[PDB]
Amino acid sequence: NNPLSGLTHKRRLSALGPGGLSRERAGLEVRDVHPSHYGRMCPIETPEGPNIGLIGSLSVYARVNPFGFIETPYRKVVDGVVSDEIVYLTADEEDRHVVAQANSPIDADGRFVEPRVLVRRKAGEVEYVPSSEVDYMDVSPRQMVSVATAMIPFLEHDDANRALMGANMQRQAVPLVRSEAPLVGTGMELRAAIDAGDVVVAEESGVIEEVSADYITVMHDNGTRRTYRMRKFARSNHGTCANQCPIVDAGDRVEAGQVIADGPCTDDGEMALGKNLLVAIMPWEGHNYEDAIILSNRLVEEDVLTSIHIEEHEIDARDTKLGAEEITRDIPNISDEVLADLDERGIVRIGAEVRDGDILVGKVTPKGETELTPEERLLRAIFGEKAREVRDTSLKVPHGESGKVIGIRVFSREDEDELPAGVNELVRVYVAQKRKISDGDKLAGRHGNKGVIGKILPVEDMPFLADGTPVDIILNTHGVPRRMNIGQILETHLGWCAHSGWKVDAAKGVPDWAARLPDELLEAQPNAIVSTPVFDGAQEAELQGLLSCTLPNRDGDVLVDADGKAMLFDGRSGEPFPYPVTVGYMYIMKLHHLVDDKIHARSTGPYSMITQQPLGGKAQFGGQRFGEMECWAMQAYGAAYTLQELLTIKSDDTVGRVKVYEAIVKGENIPEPGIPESFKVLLKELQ
C-alpha cells in the first residue's frame, strides 16, 4: 500500500505456520505482552483481528543472533557511570542484570543524579534501585516500539488501544498524487522512507550529469557514470500507484547515501503518508456525528486527497473443442460505435477512457450448433445471420471500474512467447483512475482517530477564521475524550505553531518554560518542520508557552489565543461563533478504504452452480448474505412474507427468480414462492 507497509511486512514476526502453532491452539497467554519483549518485539504494533498477539513487529534497534534469539543493545554502566560502550544482550542475558530506563537524569560525566532510579528487573519488576546497582541502560526511549509505532508523535499521550490502531492504519495509507511531509514529525520518517527501499539513494558521491523524468545520471569523482531509472506509474500489489520523481537538478553535488529521488508517500526523503489539514474541533450541524468528518471542497478542487489507482485486467485466447478462441475486432451483433475505441486487433487503444461495460479485448468463442436454445435458433432464423457460430466472450470493464488505459501487454504463442499449453494469445490491459476524495472515503490520523467523510461542503460554508481562510476539516469534539488520544489535540497545537512560527522573548533572559528547549527552537519561520520523538520531545509546559508567542499573520494580528483557540465565523449565516474553537493543523491520511471500491449492488447475476445461490463478494458480482442472525430479526418482527421472499424467489428458487423478473418487467404481481433447490440438494445428500 505504502513504503511503510512494506517495511513493516519485512519486519514481521509471525507465530503462525508450520513448526509454530495452530490458531485454534493458542490461548490468551501466547498473545499478550511478555516482559522479555522489551527492545525486541513491539508491544503496540499488532493486528486487532483474529491474529492479535500472534503477529508482532520487530523493535527498531533489535537484531537476531546466529542462534535465533533476538538481541537488543544497551549502554554498559560500570559503577553508576554512563559509558559509550554498547553491548547486545539476548533475552536471558538481560535477566542476569538490571537495566535503567532510557530517560534517566545523567551527569555530563555519566553519574546518575538520583541514587534510586527506576530500574527494570527479571520477571518484569519495576522499582527504584541504587545507582551502584545499575549495570546497563537503554539506548533510546523508543527502544521498545516498532518503526510504525515510533512514527506516532506524542505517543506517550495516547492509550495503547488507539495507538495500536494508529500504527496499523499508517500502513493502510494511500499514495497521493503529490505528497506533503508532516509539520509535526518524530524523526523516524526519514530513516523509514530510506530503509523501506522505495526512494532512490545515491550509491556513490558525484555530480548530476543529466536529469529527466525517466532517469538520473550521476557522474562520479573517479570518472564512472551510474544511471538510476525512475519507476513511473507502476501498479503495486494492492492497486496503488508507485511513482518515483527526481529531486535533484542538473549539476548538483550530491553526497553518497543521499536521496536523489523519492517515490510514493515521500517528500524530500521523509514518509508522507498524508497531508497537513487545517482542523477545527467543533460540532457542525450534526454532519460530524460520532467521528463523521466534514471536509472542505478545497481538498477536491486542489487534489489534496486525490490518489492514482491502477487495475490490471487480463484475458486469454485458447484452443477449444470446436476450434480456437480468436481475439478480433469483428464481434457478432455489435455496432461500430462500441468497437470505436478498439484497434484493428480488437484491443482498446492507449489513452482511451473506458467506463464499466466497455470492451477492452474482443474475443469470440465458437459455440456448437447442438448447444443452441430453441428460441435462440428461431431468433437466428428470423434474422438471417448465418455463419455466426461464435459467441461473445470479450473482456469488459467490471462494475465500478473507470479510467484511462495506460498500458497494453500482448503475449502470443505465434509471437514466440511461451504460454501455458492450450493458449494461443494473452492480453493484459492496465487501467488507471484518478480518485478524488469522495463522500464516505475513510480518513484517519496517527492516533487511531478514524472516520468516514460525512459531508463535503462548499468552500464558503466552512467555518472560516478571521482573515477569511476556511478550515479544511471539521473533527467532532465528542469523539475525543473517550478514546484517550489527546495526542491529536497536542499535535493540533504544535501543528499550528509549525504553520505560523514563534519568537521567544530574548530580553531579560530566556523565560522559565523554554530553558530546557534547545536554542534552535527559540525562533521558527512559518511552515517549519519539527520532531517529537516517542517518549521524549515536546512537553506541555513548552507547548503552552509556544502558543503564547505565535507569529502574526501577514496583516500583523495573531489569530489563535494562548489557549490554542481562535474565533470562527459561520460561513452559512455570517454570525461569528459564540465561543473560541481549538484550531490547528493535523496530519490526515487517506486510508485504502474508499467508497469507490466498497460500494456494490446487484439485481440479478451469477449463481453458484451447486447450491444455485448467488455468488459472493463484489468481484464476482454477488449479492449480500442474509445470514442466520438476520432471519431471527425477520421472525421477531413477524414479517413472514419478507423472509419467505428472501429465502426462495429472491435467491434459491430455480424457476421463481425468472418468473419474478418476468412479473416485474410485465407489470404483473409477484408470483408465489416455490421450493428451494438447496433443500432438494440436502435431500439428495441425505440419500
Partner: peptide, 23 residues
C-alpha cells in the same frame, strides 16, 4: 538538528536525550 548524516531536510527535534546509537 535531527539526522544530520545523509543531507536530509533540517527537521528540528525537541529532544533532551542524546542518541548514543543510530538506527
Amino acid at each position: 538538528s535531527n539526522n544530520s548524516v545523509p543531507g536530509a531536510p533540517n527537521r528540528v527535534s525537541f529532544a533532551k536525550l542524546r542518541e548514543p546509537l543510530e538506527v
